[PDB]
Symmetry: C2
Subunit: 138 residues, 2 copies
Amino acid sequence: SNAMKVLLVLTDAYSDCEKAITYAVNFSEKLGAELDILAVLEDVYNLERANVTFGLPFPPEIKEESKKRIERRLREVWEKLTGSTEIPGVEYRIGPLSEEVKKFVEGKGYELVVWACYPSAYLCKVIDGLNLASLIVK
Amino acid sequence: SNAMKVLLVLTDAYSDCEKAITYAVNFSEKLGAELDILAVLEDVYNLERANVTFGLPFPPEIKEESKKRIERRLREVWEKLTGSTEIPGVEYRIGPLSEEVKKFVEGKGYELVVWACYPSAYLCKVIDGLNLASLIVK
């Protein structure tokens, strides 16, 4: 299969990134790429850590709230561009971006990774540590 | 118009960069983008410098030949993808990459920059500085 394997990486903290989601849809459609979506819940992760550190409690529903904000944002763009709201399945990982992207992506052969509106300064390292093209959407 | 403006940034130093040039072509083709090409002769620049410091002769052929190799390399990939040798015009600039790209892009409305295999490690600052998406092709 010559299907360009692409991964869209989303953050629950920067779920409003139409430009990135658009790039992905265009690769999927116009370039026939095999698209997968990974959403890292970094904010939910920081909650877990504040919990351990200060004993700050938080409702398990928080996970779902983020999952839905993300999924809604996907449908909006997908429908707007594709007239359809059938989006890919979303894989959720709770932890540090770099670390989680690395784990997830390993040995899956992704030719490209599209980073959704995440602060560039913090990607510099991972992008280098990864052997695949990176599309930094600002 | 509603045609996405993309800039392909080629460099003096890093020759063999087919993958990057390829992504660029595809955007022009499948994604109907208005692609422009910019080649920063960084190696030539660093030479004019060592010239001044040491006063060693600096033949005009170096520059011309540097442009010719680049053009050849474009044609190869271009031709391999589209049966045509017809290639966009290349704009040459002689200076530090980071510096030259900022100036060139200056209010031109480019929304995406495809980096031609220049070490991603060195672009960290420039990518963050720029207000457009960056496709790092390793």
